[PDB]
Each structure stands twice: as structure tokens, then as C-alpha cells.
């Protein structure tokens, strides 16, 4: 019927501003700190929370993530520890999705991984590398646990493959990549009603401003990655600013 | 002979088997426009007369085909006293295989308006032939290689820059061959509108598996033909080395349709498949998504990538192509493991026995065919892809017999 | 099967007259191992049970015929001229020394001479050597100045791979004369039971011509493919001039043809003017020289003067008598290439056409585009490509700034 | 008529002795040192002085000589200075014969040459590397100018070319070479009566005396030049033992 994130994306409508999306990858430093950190994302005002599943070799994320979900893996980083983190998300009051790399799913098992990221309280997944070309098991266990389902858009997507996309998404579309971000999401916006994040290199309180006026979420990763390097005190300051700038437009 | 498609084609979607599902495309949205592009211009150009001609020229006039079948009568001795016949692929242009796939795409490239062109290399052999095409092509060029195979095949390194190609040494993960794959992976993402990715073996997303494999068929076509001539007969087994397997799908694929004739790849199996510095992706692998497709790799118990370990540049790999995978399946195509020393001992012996001082990686395949051919015996004929020839490994090669 | 007998010199070895260019200059403690050759090869050379073998081998081992590309993108830097090149760069060792060293190495298998010795300066030769040495089963021992094995290392490296013994010379200038010097002292002293595999179209009766004979092979292809290719004889056929042995290999099929003009590049180094050169015919004379009467580079009393060139397979004093006849007959035209022009040339064909080729034959290509200019739009220039850059890599990369 | 050289083997045959054939390149250590041990070599019992021609490529030399005579090229040496030494020769009441690759000949011109050394006081020339198949023109300046001419034979000679070899030398035969060198003179003996010299790396006196036995001359070379650098003095003993090693009684 509804989107597991639907609520969400309406109360940020109805509140007048956009949803605070945030990435933290598991294992970073370590474990114990990452899920620390994830709590504290959820205490400093993020509306989801993005639970990074760190990949041997991660060809889509830029150098901050890449070299935390390196140092993750170095640290001995299981998947079973990011479904921990889920389940201590969903006990502290978020809402956990996770993001992830398709193999680590496929060794997993596609249906037993979202039998337990329902478990844990997850809600969804977000899948970087897995197009719907690839999506039959996926959309089957989408369906049967009833997680939302974040395919990713491109600048480039030809409009037969955006329409495609955005009708295999529920929840919302990861409009990932200058007038290119807004451009995206009014492609996105003449074919659906559902929630477009858009995840820009997002830094200050300002270009999460800038984003709030068009996207219906506003994606930071790298930023809160950095942060929490300098220290837990540092995540908790720049994402009380990133929760002030979505609220501004 | 490209435009004519074969039974043992994928979908649409580039799947081989069916229900089994190898292949397809494990790819970002982001690249889906350019492959889809890429795609349609292979399928359009495979049937153009005026793209088959200029293939056909420059592999004639150009590279050097056909490429001689040798028969390599000192190695029956230590072969069984079976026949070795010996696909001199180490005569090509810029002396490896690599030279036939990088013409059909490079000329591909230029169909599509394409103005630069990116590779990865291991070996370097596959950075050469592309630099070498760009450069008669008038291409921009910039080649990924891992900072571990800069250094051991440094030769490799100095010709490209020679012909003109843009050198980046890549320093992250295991900084060889899937970590320069990584590397031209984000610069096609980035770069996609203006740029061709010309890959070099017959994995990756669909269309590079069936494509790279198209263009590698002439080396099994030739083959079939001149052994029915030399010989009077199909061959009793047909080998090959297998990284990625483009020389391996090459020579094994005119002969998928003989049932007699008994193929076998092998694979890299480094210090030994039990010390956990290997590249034998079938003995050791298994199924999962990697680097585009669904294929076999090494990969821990939470699907993380394992590092592979060879003496060879070129088979330093912990995947292989789908359509591989699929042939295992069926149980078409016997895989089998190679150790670093066994490699070795037939880059010696054929140096010392027939003149041919063959690429590493070939040395595989010829340690392979040593022991099959003590398996058959007397009078067996045994065709073997002799990828490329040993420059690039004469360093290496003389540090391991101490010729310093 | 066997080519007339029309330019050969007489029973003597002379071209010319019974006192002219060749003949045999060598102490009577080698008369007997020479007229022993010298016989086995009149024998053999109307055997077509031999050119069967050599032939057998050229096809299937060494990969012939070596095809003949037009080097389109080398036009406007040739006079708008077109330039074929014969791609003897793509023959197994890569360079045509492998076509006269199978013909001898049969020949000494076939006088049941059991060790086999030559010089060398590039290297290629003695690969090329001791690549036939171990294909035949032969004892081989190589002989190169120090210069040379310290410019040419990666070929020091392959021969001992294959098996030879490489000796470094340490006399006189350190190069090819100085190699030959060597492995002339090690047959007088192993007459008994070693055949001297001379790489060059000179030294004493039989050598130049037999040579020669090896190497017609070369002009014989490109006399047929050219036509095919231009619909003409060509207006010129140009090579580089070390010996002689590639040049005179793809002249001597166009010497009956009038109208073909024929024109040999020897290197210059740093200049003819400057005495650190190794242009044999535009600055020596007539003398006797390593076994046969011809030009060298000597001093008033006759001294040989040491030759310089940044490519070691042309720093030679000497050239080969039937060149030294062609040249006063007025057939053919020698002229000087420096070290600059060649390197020039070697990095145009780089880029432009994606082949590296041997130093030596850059020489080929440098005077085939000055050619082109006064030859002008259409002429049609048929270019020896004796061999690939592969040894010359390192010192190609620190020319052009390539490696710091 | 008889040869430049028959007198001296006639007189060395009546006195029951051979020949003591001595070698010195020219210019070495420099010009006038050589010219004083080749003085030396006639003052000490030497009856033929084979003055030596340095050569830039002496592909027949072994290591004593090469390295001589590249000492002697690199000190300036000239072809006009062998004509000097064999012109101190004569004056010293030696014998002279020249000793020379054949291509300084060929630079010089054969007949001048021939000319100028017969002028010089010179007996004969030797040539190591010109075989009669190619001496056209030096047999046309030998019978002019009344010069000897000295071939070479091998232990490998075939029956006809050392008869042709022999029926072409004046002077004296030089078997050039262990029972080869008693095999080769009887060889040369049962063709001809020409006189015969052996070379055979002779050092000692009792080398010297053993030679004489059979041979008509015996010639020394590398152990003369090997004497010379250590000291005149040294070359005159060494060369009176060998004085007294060719005779007999
Ligand atoms: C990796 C590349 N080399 C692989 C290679 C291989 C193995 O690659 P296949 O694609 O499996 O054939 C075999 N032989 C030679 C001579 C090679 O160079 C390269 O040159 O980039
Ligand atoms: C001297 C040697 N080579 C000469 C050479 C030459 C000159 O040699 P010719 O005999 O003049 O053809 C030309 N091209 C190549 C590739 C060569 O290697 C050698 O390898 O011993
Ligand atoms: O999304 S990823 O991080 C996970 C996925 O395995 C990576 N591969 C890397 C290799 N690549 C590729 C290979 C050969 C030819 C062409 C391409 Cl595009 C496809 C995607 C990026
Ligand atoms: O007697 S020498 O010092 C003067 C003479 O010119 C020298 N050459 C050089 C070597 N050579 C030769 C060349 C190629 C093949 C075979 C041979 Cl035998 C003939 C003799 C020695
Ligand atoms: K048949
Ligand atoms: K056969
Ligand atoms: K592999
Ligand atoms: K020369």
C-alpha cells in the first residue's frame, strides 16, 4: 500500500522543510564508535539514517567513505555488525536504511538478508549498483518484508530508464551526480509524486539549504564521515547546522 | 565473421544460461546510458560491411594475421610423447592477443565520436595494444595500471608512454589488475560522453563479455582451420590460461560445437591454492556480482573481494568472465590449477627446447598442456594459445633461474 | 625453387671482376672450415629437401610472409608520398635476422657441426642465434662488445634465457667490430667442430652471398604485395644500412627493375663532419676489412677508425661488398642519417602509427620522409622495417624525457 | 735465381742449425725503443728480424703482441716507421722481412710499397691474412722489386691448397701452429725443398732446440715482446739461450 519512509516524507512536508538524510559507514572507527556515532546522528536531528555496508571495493564513493570503509575492514567489520546497528537505531528512535553493495547481499542470501534487516527495524535499501534490470529476487523481497526500495537516478539516465527507475522505487529516488541536481529531480517530479533525495557533496548549513528548496531530502555522507573523524563533538555540531539548514526553505 | 551470431549468445540482457543468470549488468544507473550506447553501436557496426573491412585490413597489413600454428615437436619428450601445437599469438602486433580485441573496439570508439579512450592493464600487454590503437587512430589515451605492475612490468610502462598514452599507477587495494579495473571504472563515470572504455578481457557488464569474445574468435577460427590441415583431424584438446579469459574464449569458442574435442583453461594458482596467495578463481571462487557481471570470484564468507597472488601480471585477477562460468557449469570447459613454479618450469623448458620465450602468463598454459599431455599420450593433439611472448617477463624470468 | 644465379660474384667470391669487390681475406688457418661451408651451402641451396626445411620454418615458426602496410599518417611529413612499410618487426625475435640465421642453422645441422658461435651488436642476431640454437639443439656462443651489451640489455638477457653463453668484448671501440674480432679468434681455434653463424651480408666468401640468399625472401614478398597494394611497382625501395643484410634482402627482387630506384640510410651519429659516425660510404674508402674487400671508415695508413651511432646495429665500420658493388655500378644510392633525424623518425612512427621500431630501422624511416619530399605527392616508397624497438625502449624513454 | 732469404738458410743448414726468426712490433714501448731492441735482436744472434706492422684490428694475435701494438698505435705509430726500422735493420747488418695485415698494404699501394721496402733494405714480407687466391698483385710487385714472399700454412691446410700455398712463398714457408707442428713441415717437405720456419709460442731454449730438429727456422714472437717489457737487458739473455737452442753442433 504505502512507503515505509512515506510518514517520514510527510511530516517533513507538513513541518515545511526537507528530511535530514545521513550516512554513516559501520565500523568506522569501530564498531562500538560507529553505532555511537549513529545514535548521535539520531539525537542531533538527522530523519534517516543511512547504514553504510563496507565493500572491498567501493568504485562509487569518493575518498572520505572509501578510506572508512577501508579502515572498517581493516578493524574486522562483519555484515551482521551493520544489522546491530540497525536494530540499536530503531531501539534509540530512528529510522535505519541501509546502503549497501550488491554482493554482500547475494553472499548473504537476498531473501534471508531482508527477513533479518526487517527484524532488525530496518526499512529499506539502498542499492548503488543494482539496476531493476538485475532486481527480480529483490523486488520479491521487497515485497514479502515489506522494505522500501532506493534505486539511484543519474544526470545521464536516458528517460526510458528513469521512468523505469523511478517506477521500481518506493520510499524514495537517490538523485545522485551547476543547474544538473534540480534538473534531476524535475525529470523525476513530471513522472512521480515519490520523495527525491539528492545526495551533492553537502558540507555547511547553506548548501543544505540550497538543496531543502527542491529535493525532498537532503543526503550528506562524506561530510559527516569527516566530522566524526575530528570527533563525536564535531558530527553532533555540523548536524544540528545540517538539521537548521533543511528547515529554512 | 562477427556479424553472424552464435547458439551460445546471451539474452538482451546479457545473460548466459538462462535461469542461472552469469553475466548481466551489475552496473550504477550512472553508466547505464554509455553501455547502452556502446550496446547499440557494436550491434549496429558487427553487420557493417564497411566496419568489417577496416577490422579485416588492419589485422591483416597491420598486425600481422594469421597467426602460425608451430608444432612444437622438442616438447613431446616431456609432454607424453603427445603433439603440441602452439598458436603463436606472441607474433601479433605489439606481441600478445590483446592486439585483436583493442582493433575491433578502438575502431568501435571511433564510430561512436568518441574521443578518448581508457584501459586498464596488468600485464601492460592490453595498455600496449590500446595505446597502440589510439596512436594510428588519432585517439586520446590514458591507461590504468596498478603501481605493483608498473614496477614488475616496467618494460610495458616506457612503450605506452612511447606511443603517446597517459600512464596513471594505481596505488589502492592489492594496486594490481581489479584495483586498475576500479580506477577506469570511476574515470568512465565521470568521463562517460566523451569517453570509450576499450576493456581487455571477456568480463565486466554486458556487451564487453560477448563483444571481447567476438573479437577474439578469429584465434579459434584460425586454429581449427590450420590443425585440419596440418594435422588431418580436430584435436584432442584445445588449452589456454585463464585471467579474465579473452585468449582462453578466443581458441576455445570455434570449437564449443565439437564434441570430441576437449577443452581446458588454467588459471593462476600463485604459491599454491591452499596458502591463500592464488588467482585460482574456479578452484577456489564462487558465485557473486563483481566488476559488472555474475561470474565466479575469490571472496570471503561476507562476499568481500579476496586479493589474488600470481607471478603473472595477467592472471593476477580474482574474477573471470561469465561466459567461463557458464561453460564450467555445463560442464564444457575443465578448469584447472597452475602453480607459480610450474609456470616457470615451462617458461624455461620451452625457451631452452623451441626458441620461444613465452609471456607468464602463457607459461601456464604450456605447464598445462605438459601434464595433459602425459594424461592422453602418445600421438594426442593438443592445441595451445600461446597468449604473447616474454619481454616484459625476461627480468623476472631471469631473476628466477639466477641469470643476473 | 632456387632464384637465378645472375648477380652472384664468382667461385671466388668477387663481384665485379676476378679482382673486385669480396673475396676472402682470411688467413689459411680457416680455408678449410671455409671451403667447407662454402660447399655444404652450394649443395644444400639447390636442395628442395633444404628449402622445404627453411621454408617449413619460415611459415609455421617464424610466422611469414611479414606483411606490407601503407603508413598513411606518415604522408604529410613525407611529401604527401605514400610509405609502405614491410613489417619485419613482426617476425619471431623481432627483426629479420631470424630469416638468415634459420638458413644457417639448418646448414650447420646439416654439416653435423655441433656448436655454433656469432657476434652480435644490436642483440638481435645473437637472439636470433641462439634462438635457432636451442630450437636445433646446437651449443651456442654469442659474442658483443661491452658498449653494446650495456645499450642493449634486454637482448643479453634473452640469449642467456634461450640457453647461450654471451661473451662481453672488451677491446678496441667495445661494439660490433670489436665482437666480430672475438668470435673470428674463437673459429680459428674451434674449426674443428664449430660453424660461425655470421649475421651481416659481409665478411669472407661465402657469407655475403649466403647472406643474401636468406634474406632475398624479404624482397620477394614485398615485389608481389606492393603490387597488389599500390597496383605499381614502387618508385623507390629504401633501407637501413648496418652490413647490409636487410637491404640488401628487400633490394635485390627490384634490381632488374629499371625503374625502381633503390637507396640505402647508413648512420651518421653525430654528424659526418664531427669523426663520431659510422657512414661507410659517404666518408670511407675502398680496403680490405673482416674478410672481404669493400668500403671502410680507415685513416692514411689503413687503420680501421672506430665508428659512433646511437643505434648499435649500424656502428659499424664496414659495409658488405655486394653493396660496395651496386653502389659503383650506380644501382643503388647511400646516403647519411644522424642520430637526431633517426630519432625523429623513431618518435613520429610512435605516435602516428603506433609501432616502435628498432633504432636502426628509425634510420630507414627518417630517409624514406626526406625521400618522399623529393620524390613528392604520390610516389610510392616500399620501406625495410627490419625490427622492433623493444631493446631501444630505455634508451628511446630517456630521448624523449620519458623516464627523467 | 734463389731467394732474398736462401743464403742465410744455406749458411744455417752447413752450420748444422736453424734459423732464429725474432718478432718485434714496431713502435713499442714508443719508435726509437723498438728500433733499439730490434738493433738488440740482430746484436744477440737473431739471422731474421720479422719487423711488425701494428694493426687496429689483429684479429690473429694473441693477447702479448695485441696489446703491444695497441700501445704502439696509441703512441703514434706509422707504416713509414716500419720502413725506418728495417732501414736501421739493414745498417746493423741484420736481415728484415715485414710482417703485416694486408690492408696498411693495400692503403699504401702494393707496388709502392713493395718499392719502398726493397728500398729500405727489406728481404721479404709476410702475410698472415692474404692468401695467394688474392695476392695477384703482390706477386707482380714481389718478382719486380726482389722480395720475398712468406705465406702461411695451417695444420687444417688441405693436400691443395698447402701444395698451393708452398709453390707460392719465396723465402721461407711459415708453419704457423702436440704433434701438429713435426706433422705439418713433413707435409711441406714432401713438396718442396723450400726452407721451413715453425711457430709454436716458443719461450725457452729447449722449446727452441726441440723445433730445430726438424724445422728450418724457428720463430719467436710473443716471448721477445713479452722480454722487451720487462727490459732490454732481459731480451738479449732470453734471446742468446734461444741463439743457442737452434743449434745442434
Ligand atoms: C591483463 C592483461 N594481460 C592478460 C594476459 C593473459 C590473460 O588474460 P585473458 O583475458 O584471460 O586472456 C594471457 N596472456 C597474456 C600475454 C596477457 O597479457 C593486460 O595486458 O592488461
Ligand atoms: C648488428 C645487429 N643488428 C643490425 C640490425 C640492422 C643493420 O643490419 P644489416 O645487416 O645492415 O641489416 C638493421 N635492423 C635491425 C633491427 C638490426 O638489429 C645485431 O643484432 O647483431
Ligand atoms: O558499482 S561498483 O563499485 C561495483 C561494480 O562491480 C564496479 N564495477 C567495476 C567494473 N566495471 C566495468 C568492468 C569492465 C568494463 C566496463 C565496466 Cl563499467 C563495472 C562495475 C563499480
Ligand atoms: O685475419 S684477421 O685479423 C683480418 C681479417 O680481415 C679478420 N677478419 C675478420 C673476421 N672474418 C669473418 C667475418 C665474417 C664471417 C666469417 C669470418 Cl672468418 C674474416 C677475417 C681477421
Ligand atoms: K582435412
Ligand atoms: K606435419
Ligand atoms: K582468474
Ligand atoms: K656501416
Same mark, same amino acid.
Given at each position: 500500500?504505502?512507503?515505509?519512509?512515506?510518514?517520514?516524507?510527510?511530516?517533513?512536508?507538513?513541518?515545511?522543510?526537507?528530511?535530514?538524510?545521513?550516512?554513516?559507514?559501520?565500523? /568506522?572507527?569501530?564498531?562500538?564508535?560507529?553505532? +555511537?556515532?549513529?545514535?548521535?546522528?539520531?539525537?542531533?536531528?538527522?530523519?534517516?539514517?543511512?547504514?553504510?555496508?563496507?565493500?572491498?571495493?567501493?568504485?562509487?564513493?569518493?575518498?572520505?567513505?572509501?578510506?572508512?570503509?577501508?579502515?572498517?575492514?581493516?578493524?574486522?567489520?562483519?555484515?551482521?555488525?551493520?544489522?546491530?546497528?540497525?536494530?540499536?537505531?530503531?531501539?534509540?528512535?530512528?529510522?535505519?536504511?541501509?546502503?549497501? /553493495?550488491?554482493?554482500?547481499?547475494?553472499?548473504?542470501? %537476498?531473501?534471508?538478508?531482508?527477513?533479518?534487516?526487517?527484524?532488525?527495524?530496518?526499512?529499506?535499501?539502498?542499492?548503488?549498483?543494482?539496476?531493476?534490470?538485475?532486481?527480480?529476487?529483490?523486488?520479491?523481497?521487497?515485497?514479502?518484508?515489506?522494505?522500501?526500495?532506493?534505486?539511484?537516478? +543519474?544526470?545521464?539516465?536516458?528517460?526510458?530508464?528513469?521512468?523505469?527507475?523511478?517506477?521500481?522505487?518506493?520510499?524514495?529516488?537517490? +538523485?545522485?551526480?551547476?543547474?544538473?541536481?534540480?534538473?534531476?529531480?524535475?525529470?523525476?517530479?513530471?513522472?512521480?509524486?515519490?520523495?527525491?533525495?539528492?545526495?551533492?557533496?553537502?558540507?555547511?548549513?547553506?548548501?543544505?539549504?540550497?538543496?531543502?528548496?527542491?529535493?525532498?531530502?537532503?543526503?550528506?555522507?562524506?561530510?559527516?564521515?569527516?566530522?566524526?573523524?575530528?570527533?563525536?563533538?564535531?558530527?553532533?555540531?555540523?548536524?544540528?547546522?545540517?538539521?537548521?539548514? %533543511?528547515?529554512?526553505? | 565473421?562477427?556479424?553472424?551470431?552464435?547458439?551460445?549468445?546471451?539474452?538482451?540482457?546479457?545473460?548466459?544460461?538462462?535461469?542461472?543468470?552469469?553475466?548481466?549488468?551489475?552496473?550504477?544507473?550512472?553508466?547505464?546510458? =554509455?553501455?547502452?550506447?556502446?550496446?547499440?553501436?557494436?550491434?549496429?557496426?558487427?553487420?557493417?560491411?564497411?566496419?568489417?573491412?577496416?577490422?579485416?585490413?588492419?589485422?591483416?597489413?597491420?598486425?600481422?594475421?594469421?597467426?602460425?600454428?608451430?608444432?612444437?615437436?622438442?616438447?613431446?619428450?616431456?609432454?607424453?610423447?603427445?603433439?603440441?601445437?602452439?598458436?603463436?599469438?606472441?607474433?601479433?602486433?605489439?606481441?600478445?592477443?590483446?592486439?585483436?580485441?583493442?582493433?575491433?573496439?578502438?575502431?568501435?570508439?571511433?564510430?561512436?565520436?568518441?574521443?578518448?579512450?581508457?584501459?586498464?592493464?596488468?600485464?601492460?600487454?592490453?595498455?600496449?595494444?590500446?595505446?597502440?590503437?589510439?596512436?594510428?587512430?588519432?585517439?586520446?589515451?590514458?591507461?590504468?595500471?596498478?603501481?605493483?605492475?608498473?614496477?614488475?612490468?616496467?618494460?610495458? =610502462?616506457?612503450?605506452?608512454?612511447?606511443?603517446?598514452?597517459?600512464?596513471?599507477?594505481?596505488?589502492?587495494?592489492?594496486?594490481?589488475?581489479?584495483?586498475?579495473?576500479?580506477?577506469?571504472?570511476?574515470?568512465?563515470?565521470?568521463?562517460?560522453?566523451?569517453?570509450?572504455?576499450?576493456?581487455?578481457?571477456?568480463?565486466?557488464?554486458?556487451?564487453?563479455?560477448?563483444? =571481447?569474445?567476438?573479437?577474439?574468435?578469429?584465434?579459434?577460427?584460425?586454429?581449427?582451420?590450420?590443425?585440419?590441415?596440418?594435422?588431418?583431424?580436430?584435436?584432442?584438446?584445445?588449452?589456454?590460461?585463464?585471467?579474465?579469459?579473452?585468449?582462453?574464449?578466443?581458441?576455445?569458442?570455434?570449437?564449443?560445437?565439437?564434441?570430441?574435442?576437449?577443452?581446458?583453461?588454467?588459471?593462476?594458482?600463485?604459491?599454491?591454492?591452499?596458502?591463500?596467495?592464488?588467482?585460482?578463481?574456479?578452484?577456489?571462487?564462487?558465485?557473486?556480482?563483481?566488476?559488472?557481471?555474475?561470474?565466479?570470484?575469490?571472496?570471503?564468507?561476507?562476499?568481500?573481494?579476496?586479493?589474488?597472488?600470481?607471478?603473472?601480471?595477467?592472471?593476477?585477477?580474482?574474477?573471470?568472465?561469465?561466459?567461463?562460468?557458464?561453460?564450467?557449469?555445463?560442464?564444457?570447459?575443465?578448469?584447472?590449477?597452475?602453480?607459480?613454479?610450474?609456470?616457470?618450469?615451462?617458461?624455461?623448458?620451452?625457451?631452452?627446447?623451441?626458441?620461444?620465450?613465452?609471456?607468464?602468463?602463457?607459461?601456464?598454459?604450456?605447464?598445462?598442456?605438459?601434464?595433459?599431455?602425459?594424461?592422453?599420450?602418445?600421438?594426442?593433439?593438443?592445441?595451445?594459445?600461446?597468449?604473447?611472448?616474454?619481454?616484459?617477463?625476461?627480468?623476472?624470468?631471469?631473476?628466477?633461474?639466477?641469470?643476473?
Amino acid at each position: 500500500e504505502a512507503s515505509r519512509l512515506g510518514p517520514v516524507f510527510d511530516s517533513c512536508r507538513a513541518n515545511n522543510r526537507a528530511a535530514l538524510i545521513g550516512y554513516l559507514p559501520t565500523g /568506522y572507527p569501530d564498531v562500538p564508535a560507529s553505532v +555511537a556515532a549513529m545514535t548521535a546522528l539520531v539525537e542531533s536531528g538527522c530523519d534517516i539514517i543511512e547504514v553504510g555496508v563496507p565493500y572491498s571495493d567501493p568504485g562509487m564513493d569518493g575518498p572520505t567513505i572509501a578510506r572508512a570503509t577501508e579502515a572498517a575492514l581493516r578493524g574486522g567489520v562483519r555484515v551482521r555488525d551493520t544489522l546491530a546497528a540497525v536494530e540499536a537505531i530503531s531501539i534509540a528512535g530512528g529510522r535505519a536504511v541501509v546502503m549497501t /553493495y550488491w554482493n554482500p547481499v547475494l553472499r548473504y542470501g %537476498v531473501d534471508a538478508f531482508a527477513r533479518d534487516l526487517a527484524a532488525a527495524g530496518g526499512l529499506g535499501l539502498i542499492t548503488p549498483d543494482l539496476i531493476p534490470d538485475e532486481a527480480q529476487q529483490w523486488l520479491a523481497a521487497s515485497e514479502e518484508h515489506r522494505l522500501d526500495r532506493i534505486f539511484l537516478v +543519474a544526470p545521464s539516465s536516458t528517460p526510458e530508464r528513469l521512468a523505469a527507475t523511478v517506477e521500481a522505487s518506493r520510499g524514495f529516488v537517490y +538523485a545522485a551526480s551547476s543547474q544538473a541536481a534540480p534538473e534531476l529531480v524535475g525529470r523525476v517530479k513530471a513522472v512521480s509524486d515519490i520523495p527525491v533525495g539528492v545526495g551533492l557533496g553537502v558540507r555547511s548549513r547553506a548548501q543544505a539549504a540550497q538543496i531543502a528548496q527542491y529535493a525532498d531530502g537532503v543526503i550528506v555522507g562524506s561530510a559527516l564521515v569527516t566530522a566524526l573523524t575530528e570527533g563525536l563533538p564535531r558530527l553532533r555540531a555540523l548536524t544540528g547546522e545540517l538539521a537548521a539548514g %533543511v528547515r529554512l526553505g | 565473421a562477427i556479424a553472424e551470431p552464435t547458439s551460445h549468445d546471451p539474452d538482451s540482457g546479457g545473460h548466459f544460461g538462462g535461469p542461472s543468470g552469469w553475466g548481466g549488468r551489475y552496473v550504477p544507473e550512472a553508466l547505464m546510458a =554509455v553501455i547502452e550506447e556502446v550496446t547499440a553501436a557494436y550491434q549496429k557496426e558487427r553487420v557493417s560491411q564497411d566496419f568489417l573491412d577496416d577490422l579485416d585490413r588492419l589485422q591483416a597489413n597491420y598486425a600481422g594475421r594469421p597467426s602460425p600454428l608451430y608444432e612444437a615437436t622438442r616438447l613431446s619428450q616431456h609432454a607424453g610423447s603427445a603433439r603440441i601445437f602452439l598458436k603463436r599469438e606472441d607474433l601479433n602486433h605489439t606481441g600478445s592477443h590483446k592486439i585483436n580485441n583493442v582493433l575491433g573496439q578502438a575502431l568501435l570508439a571511433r564510430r561512436m565520436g568518441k574521443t578518448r579512450v581508457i584501459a586498464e592493464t596488468g600485464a601492460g600487454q592490453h595498455g600496449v595494444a590500446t595505446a597502440t590503437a589510439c596512436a594510428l587512430l588519432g585517439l586520446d589515451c590514458v591507461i590504468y595500471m596498478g603501481g605493483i605492475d608498473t614496477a614488475r612490468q616496467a618494460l610495458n =610502462v616506457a612503450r605506452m608512454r612511447l606511443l603517446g598514452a597517459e600512464v596513471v599507477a594505481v596505488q589502492t587495494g592489492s594496486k594490481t589488475l581489479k584495483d586498475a579495473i576500479n580506477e577506469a571504472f570511476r574515470d568512465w563515470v565521470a568521463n562517460a560522453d566523451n569517453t570509450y572504455y576499450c576493456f581487455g578481457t571477456a568480463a565486466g557488464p554486458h556487451p564487453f563479455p560477448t563483444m =571481447v569474445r567476438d573479437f577474439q574468435r578469429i584465434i579459434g577460427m584460425e586454429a581449427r582451420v590450420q590443425i585440419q590441415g596440418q594435422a588431418g583431424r580436430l584435436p584432442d584438446a584445445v588449452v589456454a590460461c585463464v585471467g579474465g579469459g579473452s585468449n582462453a574464449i578466443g581458441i576455445f569458442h570455434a570449437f564449443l560445437d565439437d564434441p570430441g574435442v576437449r577443452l581446458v583453461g588454467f588459471e593462476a594458482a600463485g604459491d599454491g591454492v591452499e596458502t591463500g596467495r592464488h588467482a585460482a578463481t574456479f578452484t577456489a571462487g564462487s558465485p557473486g556480482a563483481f566488476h559488472g557481471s555474475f561470474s565466479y570470484l575469490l571472496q570471503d564468507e561476507d562476499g568481500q573481494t579476496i586479493e589474488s597472488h600470481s607471478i603473472s601480471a595477467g592472471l593476477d585477477y580474482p574474477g573471470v568472465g561469465p561466459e567461463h562460468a557458464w561453460l564450467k557449469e555445463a560442464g564444457r570447459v575443465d578448469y584447472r590449477p597452475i602453480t607459480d613454479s610450474e609456470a616457470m618450469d615451462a617458461f624455461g623448458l620451452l625457451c631452452r627446447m623451441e626458441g620461444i620465450i613465452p609471456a607468464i602468463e602463457s607459461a601456464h598454459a604450456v605447464a598445462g598442456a605438459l601434464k595433459l599431455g602425459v594424461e592422453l599420450g602418445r600421438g594426442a593433439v593438443i592445441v595451445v594459445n600461446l597468449s604473447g611472448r616474454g619481454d616484459k617477463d625476461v627480468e623476472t624470468a631471469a631473476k628466477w633461474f639466477g641469470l643476473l
